[PDB]
Design a protein around this ligand. Structure first.
Ligand SMILES: Nc1ncnc2c1ncn2[C@@H]1O[C@H](COP(=O)(O)OP(=O)(O)O)[C@@H](O)[C@H]1O
Ligand SMILES: Nc1ncnc2c1ncn2[C@@H]1O[C@H](COP(=O)(O)OP(=O)(O)O)[C@@H](O)[C@H]1O
Ligand SMILES: [Mg+2]
Ligand SMILES: [Mg+2]
Lengths: 141, 57, 141
């Protein structure tokens, strides 16, 4: 098949569960397992959470943008923000690394993303914003 | 009862999913599908996803 | 509060469930009654189906556009399509009226919209597309 969806919401935090539901409900079309989904909703919470806090330093006007393109059993997620951006990519993408070590969750994030998803490609450019790929093929039995 | 707050209503269905999951896992002999769980509950795969979220929090 | 969301997706029969769940998840922030969230959820399905089966006459390349605005106990729903358009609005809105009678068409629809929502406004232009408003004031005790 070929199903695509595009979502845009304010960079508030109360929109976390919302981003999860929306992406999951859409990827639910691929007939996944309750786990594959719970993973997807995590991968999402990671990227979307980053944007909200890093990209827009929690500015309720930041507007987060999500894109999902299911096709031939392969989910094609994408989260992007027009915020602050990431100076060093490979470095900010290293395990335990942070800019806001204000705990509250971890130091992990690109680790979780890197883990669950089959492929994760990041892209940023100071003040322009970041565009995280994220892809996860889903199988059948 | 109408004024089921949605919080309570959604949370209740959430548990039913945990249960339906292991039930079908045994019944099928492998992890069950969102759809299969949806059907087992007389609900849509989307409502399963929605209800699930309420149970985690 | 002023929370807003914007969703777009292929005009596929399959995205009707996706759409209501998404809207529901979002309008959920208002902590409405399971009763209210259902009406809201019904209206979304009626309007998106209408957009898909009428506006785009089932053409997947359609792209339905949804927009929700939560702002102080009120839900602001908007379903839009760059489709066929409605020749006569007043006629299309009278109960039991349909253009696809020979296709098991619940004569109802706009009638359902009007009953569940507080306000329903339609703006349409042939070969331009259609936009249904829909406003729901959610109760607070
Ligand atoms: N959307 C984003 N906008 C700006 N910087 C980001 C974004 N996502 C990640 N980063 C950078 O990568 C670092 C590591 O992110 P992550 O692994 O999720 O841990 P954490 O969420 O604890 O920061 C962040 O502190 C930040 O400097
Ligand atoms: N988005 C739309 N695009 C084109 N025509 C529409 C649209 N929505 C409604 N209509 C017109 O209004 C009629 C009535 O819609 P409705 O009351 O929902 O009934 P039904 O869904 O059974 O056709 C439709 O048959 C169609 O001709
Ligand atoms: Mg993070
Ligand atoms: Mg209709």
């Amino acid at each position: 098949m070929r199903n695509e969806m595009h979502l845009q919401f304010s960079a508030r935090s109360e929109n976390e569960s919302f981003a999860r539901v929306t992406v999951a409900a859409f990827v639910a079309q691929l007939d996944p397992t309750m786990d594959e989904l719970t993973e997807i909703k995590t991968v999402v919470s990671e990227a979307v959470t980053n944007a909200i806090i890093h990209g827009y330093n929690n500015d309720p006007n930041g507007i987060v943008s999500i894109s999902v393109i299911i096709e031939d059993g392969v989910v094609h997620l994408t989260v992007r923000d027009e915020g602050v951006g990431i100076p060093d990519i490979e470095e900010a993408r290293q395990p335990l690394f942070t800019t806001k070590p204000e705990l509250e969750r971890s130091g992990m994030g690109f680790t979780i993303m890197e883990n669950f998803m089959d492929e994760v490609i990041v892209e940023s450019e100071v003040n322009k914003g970041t565009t995280v790929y994220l892809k996860k093929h889903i199988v059948k039995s | 009862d109408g004024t089921v707050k949605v919080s309570r209503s959604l949370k209740e269905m959430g548990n039913k999913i945990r249960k339906a999951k292991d039930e079908l896992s045994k019944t099928r002999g492998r992890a069950p599908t969102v759809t299969e769980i949806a059907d087992h509950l007389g609900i849509s795969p989307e409502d399963v996803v929605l209800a699930q979220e309420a149970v985690r929090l």
